[PDB]
Amino acid sequence: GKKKVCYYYDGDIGNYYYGQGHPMKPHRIRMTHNLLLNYGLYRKMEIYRPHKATAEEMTKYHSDEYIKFLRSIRPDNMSEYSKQMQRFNVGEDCPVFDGLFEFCQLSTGGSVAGAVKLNRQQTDMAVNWAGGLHHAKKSEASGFCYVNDIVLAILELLKYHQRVLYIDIDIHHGDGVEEAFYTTDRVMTVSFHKYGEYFPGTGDLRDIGAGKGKYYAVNFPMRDGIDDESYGQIFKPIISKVMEMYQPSAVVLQCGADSLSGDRLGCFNLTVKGHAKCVEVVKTFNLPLLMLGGGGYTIRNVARCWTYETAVALDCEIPNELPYNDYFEYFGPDFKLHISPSNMTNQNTPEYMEKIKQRLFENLRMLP
Numbered sequence: 001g002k003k004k005v006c007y008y009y010d011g012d013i014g015n016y017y018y019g020q021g022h023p024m025k026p027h028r029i030r031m032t033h034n035l036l037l038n039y040g041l042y043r044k045m046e047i048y049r050p051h052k053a054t055a056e057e058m059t060k061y062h063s064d065e066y067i068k069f070l071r072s073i074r075p076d077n078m079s080e081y082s083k084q085m086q087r088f089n090v091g092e093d094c095p096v097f098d099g100l101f102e103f104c105q106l107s108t109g110g111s112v113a114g115a116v117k118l119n120r121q122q123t124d125m126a127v128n129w130a131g132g133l134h135h136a137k138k139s140e141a142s143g144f145c146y147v148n149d150i151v152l153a154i155l156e157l158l159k160y161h162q163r164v165l166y167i168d169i170d171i172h173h174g175d176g177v178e179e180a181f182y183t184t185d186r187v188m189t190v191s192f193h194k195y196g197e198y199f200p201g202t203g204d205l206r207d208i209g210a211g212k213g214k215y216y217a218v219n220f221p222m223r224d225g226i227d228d229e230s231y232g233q234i235f236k237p238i239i240s241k242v243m244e245m246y247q248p249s250a251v252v253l254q255c256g257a258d259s260l261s262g263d264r265l266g267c268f269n270l271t272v273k274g275h276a277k278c279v280e281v282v283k284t285f286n287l288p289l290l291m292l293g294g295g296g297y298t299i300r301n302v303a304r305c306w307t308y309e310t311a312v313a314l315d316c317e318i319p320n321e322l323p324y325n326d327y328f329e330y331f332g333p334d335f336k337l338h339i340s341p342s343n344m345t346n347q348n349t350p351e352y353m354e355k356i357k358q359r360l361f362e363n364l365r366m367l368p
């Protein structure tokens with residue numbers, strides 16, 4: 001039936017700025033919050049302000065040297081850290097900006113607090129739209145990500161859950177999370193992403209895990225222009241088979257919105273309904289669920305997407321006509337919640353989709 005939903009948000013998150021021209025815009029988190037408040041979605045959720053995660057909480061995964069660097073670097077002292085900046089991949093994709101460490105603490109705080117709430121059985125679903133920064137590595141920043149809030153949240157869930165399933169629907173491969181758990185069977189990572197001449201270059205369907213983790217990493221490589229019909233046709237059957245074979249006791253779903261049509265960096269053609277069908281599919285299994293953000297670079301569509309996915313979590317129907325809000329002008333010329341797909345060609349033929357699904361099913365037959 002209807003579930004208890006806890007939502008994590010800090011009103012300062014929207015003020016963090018990556019710099020002029022950088023596609024990552026924390027302001028999209030504030031637009032999402034304001035839109036869902038104006039739809040009345042606050043009347044059904046417990047809203048919490050996450051704590052600022054400590055360097056100590058972050059070192060449950062990341063190295064002490066890397067977290068010490070993040071806590072020390074600033075735009076005013078950057079000249080003294082040229083050596084560590086190259087070593088930790090701090091540069092154009094992952095720049096030094098004012099309040100960088102505080103932004104990491106808030107993003108991580110929401111994910112870890114959500115996992116603690118799920119572990120205590122105090123909620124069925126926990127939502128942190130500021131999290132989902134799946135590329136960050138143990139001692140390296142990557143792809144706009146500095147601290148891997150997902151790995152930290154999963155480590156928290158592993159205190160009470162023997163098996164945790166991670167599902168990633170961002171257009172980019174969830175490499176940081178896959179790498180962190182590559183040799184263990186306690187986490188199964190499933191990533192659906194664009195593969196071929198695209199960042200980060202990993203996530204081949206032949207990458208299936210190693211050692212005790214062999215068959216516990218699943219990658220569905222896709223080409224440009226995937227649509228709701230095609231995505232929906234493989235998502236439910238793959239997730240159903242994974243649920244049946246793996247039997248996880250908790251789930252983490254990364255809801256990166258750069259897989260929507262019209263994304264500034266993505267080249268997929270999903271609508272908000274097609275993207276949200278993934279949330280509906282996962283929710284149907286009735287397991288403790290941590291829903292996270294991620295990519296999304298056409299910020300009016302990210303706000304529409306995550307507002308609709310929050311409504312899905314709450315089993316609340318919301319009208320297509322957008323209510324008046326602080327960012328109303330960003331949603332023109334239509335002022336509607338739902339989006340239309342473009343005329344882009346879907347390079348993922350129905351035969352390619354079935355063939356990749358069949359190869360993934362063969363790998364899933366290898367689980368105990």
Ligand SMILES: CCN1CCC2(CC1)C[C@@H]2C(=O)N[C@@H](CCCCCC(O)(O)CC)c1ncc(-c2ccc3c(=O)n(CC)ccc3c2)[nH]1
Nearest residue numbers: 020021022023092093133143144170172199258294295296
């Ligand atoms: C310098 C850019 N150059 C790209 C090629 C280069 C090396 C840097 C090889 C690496 C690569 O392709 N980086 C990828 C990383 C994608 C992370 C997704 C993150 C998630 O969505 O998965 C989850 C949060 C990527 N794609 C597009 C950009 C991009 C475009 C434009 C700009 C830009 O105008 N500015 C203003 C100075 C700053 C940054 C910047 C970055 N970077």
Ligand SMILES: [Ca+2]
Nearest residue numbers: 168170172192
């Ligand atoms: Ca993905």
Ligand SMILES: [Ca+2]
Nearest residue numbers: 181187213216
């Ligand atoms: Ca694994």
Ligand SMILES: [Zn+2]
Nearest residue numbers: 170172258295
């Ligand atoms: Zn992405």
